[PDB]
Amino acid sequence: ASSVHWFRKGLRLHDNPALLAAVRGARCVRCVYILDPWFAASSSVGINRWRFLLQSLEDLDTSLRKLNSRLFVVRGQPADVFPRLFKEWGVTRLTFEYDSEPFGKERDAAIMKMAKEAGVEVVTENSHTLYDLDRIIELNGQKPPLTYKRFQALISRMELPKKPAVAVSSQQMESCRAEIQENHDDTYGVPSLEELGFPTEGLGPAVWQGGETEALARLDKHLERKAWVANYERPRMNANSLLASPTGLSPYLRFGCLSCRLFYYRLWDLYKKVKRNSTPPLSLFGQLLWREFFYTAATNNPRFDRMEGNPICIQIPWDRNPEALAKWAEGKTGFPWIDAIMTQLRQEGWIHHLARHAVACFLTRGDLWVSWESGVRVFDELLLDADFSVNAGSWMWLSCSAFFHCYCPVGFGRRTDPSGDYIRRYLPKLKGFPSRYIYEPWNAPESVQKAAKCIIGVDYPRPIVNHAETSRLNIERMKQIY
Amino acid sequence: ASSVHWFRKGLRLHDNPALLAAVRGARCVRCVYILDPWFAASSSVGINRWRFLLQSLEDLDTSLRKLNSRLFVVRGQPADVFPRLFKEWGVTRLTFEYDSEPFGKERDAAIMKMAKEAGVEVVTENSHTLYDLDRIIELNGQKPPLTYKRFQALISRMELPKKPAVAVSSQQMESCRAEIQENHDDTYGVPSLEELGFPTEGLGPAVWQGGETEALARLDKHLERKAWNSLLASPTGLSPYLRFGCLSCRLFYYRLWDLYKKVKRNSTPPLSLFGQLLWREFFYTAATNNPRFDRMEGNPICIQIPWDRNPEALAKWAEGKTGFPWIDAIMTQLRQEGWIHHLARHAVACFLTRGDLWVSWESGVRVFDELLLDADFSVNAGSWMWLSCSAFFCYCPVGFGRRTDPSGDYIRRYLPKLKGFPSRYIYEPWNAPESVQKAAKCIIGVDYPRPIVNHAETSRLNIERMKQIY
Ligand SMILES: COc1ccc(-n2nc3c(c2NC(=O)C2(c4ccc(Cl)cc4)CCCC2)CS(=O)(=O)C3)cc1
Numbered sequence: 001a002s003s004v005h006w007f008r009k010g011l012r013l014h015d016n017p018a019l020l021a022a023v024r025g026a027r028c029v030r031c032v033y034i035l036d037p038w039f040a041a042s043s044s045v046g047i048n049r050w051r052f053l054l055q056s057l058e059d060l061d062t063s064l065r066k067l068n069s070r071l072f073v074v075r076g077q078p079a080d081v082f083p084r085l086f087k088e089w090g091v092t093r094l095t096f097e098y099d100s101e102p103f104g105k106e107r108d109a110a111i112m113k114m115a116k117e118a119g120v121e122v123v124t125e126n127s128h129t130l131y132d133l134d135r136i137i138e139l140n141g142q143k144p145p146l147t148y149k150r151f152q153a154l155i156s157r158m159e160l161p162k163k164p165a166v167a168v169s170s171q172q173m174e175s176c177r178a179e180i181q182e183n184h185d186d187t188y189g190v191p192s193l194e195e196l197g198f199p200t201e202g203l204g205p206a207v208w209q210g211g212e213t214e215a216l217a218r219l220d221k222h223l224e225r226k227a228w229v230a231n232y233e234r235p236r237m238n239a240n241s242l243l244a245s246p247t248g249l250s251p252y253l254r255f256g257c258l259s260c261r262l263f264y265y266r267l268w269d270l271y272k273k274v275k276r277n278s279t280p281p282l283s284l285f286g287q288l289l290w291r292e293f294f295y296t297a298a299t300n301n302p303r304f305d306r307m308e309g310n311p312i313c314i315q316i317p318w319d320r321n322p323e324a325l326a327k328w329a330e331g332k333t334g335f336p337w338i339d340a341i342m343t344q345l346r347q348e349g350w351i352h353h354l355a356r357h358a359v360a361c362f363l364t365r366g367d368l369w370v371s372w373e374s375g376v377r378v379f380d381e382l383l384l385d386a387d388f389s390v391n392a393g394s395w396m397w398l399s400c401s402a403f404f405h406c407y408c409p410v411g412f413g414r415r416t417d418p419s420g421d422y423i424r425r426y427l428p429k430l431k432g433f434p435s436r437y438i439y440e441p442w443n444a445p446e447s448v449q450k451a452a453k454c455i456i457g458v459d460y461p462r463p464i465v466n467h468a469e470t471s472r473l474n475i476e477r478m479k480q481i482y
Numbered sequence: 483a484s485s486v487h488w489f490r491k492g493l494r495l496h497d498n499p500a501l502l503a504a505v506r507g508a509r510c511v512r513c514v515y516i517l518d519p520w521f522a523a524s525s526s527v528g529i530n531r532w533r534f535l536l537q538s539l540e541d542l543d544t545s546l547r548k549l550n551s552r553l554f555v556v557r558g559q560p561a562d563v564f565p566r567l568f569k570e571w572g573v574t575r576l577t578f579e580y581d582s583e584p585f586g587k588e589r590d591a592a593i594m595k596m597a598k599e600a601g602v603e604v605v606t607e608n609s610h611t612l613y614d615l616d617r618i619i620e621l622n623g624q625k626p627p628l629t630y631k632r633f634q635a636l637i638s639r640m641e642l643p644k645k646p647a648v649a650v651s652s653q654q655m656e657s658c659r660a661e662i663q664e665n666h667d668d669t670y671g672v673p674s675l676e677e678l679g680f681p682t683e684g685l686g687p688a689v690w691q692g693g694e695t696e697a698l699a700r701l702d703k704h705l706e707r708k709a710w711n712s713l714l715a716s717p718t719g720l721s722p723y724l725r726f727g728c729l730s731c732r733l734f735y736y737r738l739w740d741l742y743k744k745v746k747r748n749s750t751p752p753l754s755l756f757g758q759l760l761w762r763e764f765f766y767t768a769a770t771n772n773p774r775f776d777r778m779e780g781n782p783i784c785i786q787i788p789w790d791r792n793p794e795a796l797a798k799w800a801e802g803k804t805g806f807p808w809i810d811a812i813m814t815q816l817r818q819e820g821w822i823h824h825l826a827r828h829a830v831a832c833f834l835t836r837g838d839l840w841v842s843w844e845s846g847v848r849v850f851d852e853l854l855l856d857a858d859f860s861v862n863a864g865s866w867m868w869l870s871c872s873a874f875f876c877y878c879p880v881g882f883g884r885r886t887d888p889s890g891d892y893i894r895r896y897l898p899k900l901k902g903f904p905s906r907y908i909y910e911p912w913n914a915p916e917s918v919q920k921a922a923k924c925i926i927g928v929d930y931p932r933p934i935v936n937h938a939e940t941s942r943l944n945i946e947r948m949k950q951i952y
């Protein structure tokens with residue numbers, strides 16, 4: 001069989017059941033990622049997401065080099081490109097990891113009709129989530145669970161997630177090794193950021209290096225007996241927690257560089273080694289289960305990112321404030337805690353969930369009363385660990401539109417990091433301000449601002465809203481809705 | 483048998499007994515909608531209704547493609563088109579859902595005359611209503627019931643509505659699949675808004691996506707919510723779909739019933755569970771034999787009230803430029819989206835009729851017929867007579883808005899020029915100080931119209947004129 005394995009997510013060779021199906025009885029397997037580099041014709045995607053993807057494809061290709069093979073990066077769009085690929089490569093089989101997200105399910109349904117007409121066999125495996133999501137939905141009566149509680153109860157009734165699949169054999173991959181022509185880097189090679197026109201000048205190393213290899217090293221470090229004390233047995237918020245952890249796994253779960261089933265059972269085995277008990281609580285896998293919740297709710301709701309027409313979403317008359325939204329998006333709100341977080345997210349592609357709470361609150365029910373839909377757009381451009389289902393679900397959750405209390409954009413920062421070094425790291429123009437005034441620089445005496453070489457209104461923007469006044473208005477609005 | 487199933491309402495494949503009749507024993511079945519493109523010869527229909535209709539026809543075509551058939555959209559008028567179509571297709575049978583409304587019933591009678599002359603069998607089914615309206619009328623002495631209590635009394639003595647018929651077989655549709663020429667889209671395609679002369683620049687997604695698929699999806703999400711109040715359009719709202727026939731009323735009826743049996747042990751629900759469906763039914767029952775149902779003069783059930791003729795005021799009410807932000811936002815939302823809340827209809831209808839302007843309900847009927855998605859002849863005309871106290875026997879245009887939405891964000895959503903005003907003045911911007919208006923960047927009388935009438939004066943005078951009627 002002539003098999004093409006299609007990489008989209010599942011950017012990994014481990015726990016790749018779709019890759020296994022391509023290799024089983026294959027004279028030739030070609031591993032493909034179809035990349036559209038025409039950025040102006042799509043919604044904006046930040047350099048961090050692109051750099052991460054490119055580093056994930058470089059790792060896939062490096063790893064396929066060890067198997068006497070290569071990664072084929074075909075530049076274009078999958079619907080336009082596949083028909084020529086089926087004919088040029090004599091493709092008899094196409095395999096890819098299932099995409100439950102509705103727009104991805106729509107694209108993949110079109111690709112499958114095109115392959116059936118071509119006579120290409122299609123095989124899919126759902127190694128992106130712990131469970132079969134449709135199974136979860138059948139058991140809830142063919143509707144998706146609408147609360148986290150009900151979702152937990154449905155999976156409490158189900159079998160354990162499938163164990164991670166064995167990786168493809170080196171011998172097996174030699175058997176189906178594709179003929180690699182010497183012009184491969186020029187046609188099918190993994191592009192650099194510079195080739196794609198990105199500003200690579202003076203660009204630091206990525207805080208979140210992409211790729212399966214990085215994810216696997218991070219998994220091992222994350223699941224060391226020492227670290228389990230820090231992040232599992234006794235979780236506590238440090239100002240160091242705001243900064244990116246070398247053991248964080250969330251970007252790699254999003255891109256598929258780390259199998260969620262592999263994480264799930266490796267974490268389970270750590271639990272068995274730390275506590276002789278073999279039965280962990282579901283809260284142990286909380287992040288993975290919230291992930292799985294949002295994928296379950298969104299798989300049949302194509303309006304999942306919208307308010308209007310979205311059956312699960314409360315309809316709320318959000319303010320239209322494009323200039324506030326842009327100031328929020330660019331870290332120019334004048335609230336250093338908010339601006340430091342948005343700066344970090346833009347520069348690095350990850351922020352702490354606490355930092356997401358503060359920043360999503362400031363845009364929505366906390367301050368600006370701007371729709372969560374806008375916040376979804378920005379996080380899609382910048383945030384590395386949340387796709388359609390997790391990003392929209394989290395925003396609706398935070399805004400109280402589907403499925404807490406919003407904190408002070410000044411006070412919450414002072415409580416999380418009283419030093420203000422987080423502020424100084426990401427808003428250097430405020431480095432001169434003392435810790436008492438760095439979260440309220442508009443309240444520092446002019447003598448303090450002159451000493452800091454930072455004049456509020458000129459060097460750093462004054463606060464764009466009065467939090468006392470906006471929260472009063474917003475709290476009464478929330479009392480009406482509820 | 484060569485069968486033509488005629489879509490008018492009943493824009494759905496589920497609970498479509500007329501389509502089941504066309505398919506059974508048929509060599510060929512053709513699903514037809516007859517669209518008059520000449521818009522200016524008929525009365526005005528807003529873009530939202532046209533959009534909802536095209537999306538419902540598009541859904542029906544998509545539904546039929548999955549059965550290896552197509553929807554024939556035939557341009558013209560049914561009286562002209564059907565003789566030519568019956569001979570060109572060798573039609574042996576015409577089927578459609580019964581239309582109880584008086585004007586459609588006269589049309590359908592004419593079509594059945596031509597069909598009989600051509601030898602074409604006609605079958606009709608009453609799947610737009612829960613009941614046989616004519617049986618309800620029988621039980622009232624062959625006169626329509628004029629109170630909701632009499633209506634409930636009659637239907638509580640009747641049998642239960644017919645359960646929804648099963649959708650048609652995919653295999654059966656193949657046996658009567660019609661020949662589809664490659665020129666089909668050129669002749670029988672579903673037109674687009676652009677092709678019908680509508681401006682579509684800047685047109686976002688419809689707030690109320692048309693079609694059966696949407697309707698069935700909303701119905702499930704509506705029952706799931708009930709198992710587990712705002713002025714904004716609900717993503718589980720069902721009412722546009724019942725008007726267009728995208729959602730079967732009987733399906734809604736019995737699924738709502740089954741929900742009652744699951745939640746409450748009692749398998750005997752109250753009539754109030756179907757209140758909206760029963761108000762729907764009441765008006766269809768009252769209108770079916772009254773050709774003057776939408777007018778005041780010559781309407782036997784309507785109280786003759788000396789309404790004022792004020793066309794300019796009527797025009798400002800329809801365009802939402804009355805100067806009352808509460809009334810104008812509602813009218814803007816109706817014009818923009820195609821649906822407004824029932825208490826918003828109340829406020830807006832009182833303002834035109836007995837509350838302030840004292841314009842006839844018949845004009846409010848005409849405006850709603852252009853803009854409103856969920857009310858056809860019987861329901862829209864009956865609601866206006868009911869509200870105006872003209873048959874079937876008010877709140878402040880500032881206070882009722884302040885009480886309904888103290889935030890005023892509903893005003894700001896649809897009247898963006900008033901966004902600057904604080905909540906204490908956004909329902910009465912004429913009482914806002916001149917500085918406040920300059921800070922809001924909206925000067926009353928220039929950027930936004932002053933209120934066309936004084937409510938204190940007109941409401942006392944109009945309550946006196948209503949008293950003279952009684
Ligand atoms: C507001 O914008 C966003 C905030 C968070 C995310 N996000 N990204 C990932 C995950 C989440 N969401 C969460 O964990 C929760 C959450 C929600 C809202 C907030 Cl504010 C914080 C947390 C969902 C309910 C409780 C925890 C889990 S993951 O692996 O599945 C990676 C995305 C966008």
Ligand SMILES: COc1ccc(-n2nc3c(c2NC(=O)C2(c4ccc(Cl)cc4)CCCC2)CS(=O)(=O)C3)cc1
Pocket residue numbers: 721724758759761762763824825827828829831850856857861862865866868869
């Ligand atoms: C004033 O213009 C209109 C107001 C309402 C409608 N309308 N549309 C539908 C329905 C109704 N009417 C009602 O239910 C009532 C009603 C009457 C007057 C008002 Cl103001 C509000 C409600 C009738 C008596 C009590 C409830 C039920 S339906 O499915 O049958 C869809 C149409 C036009």
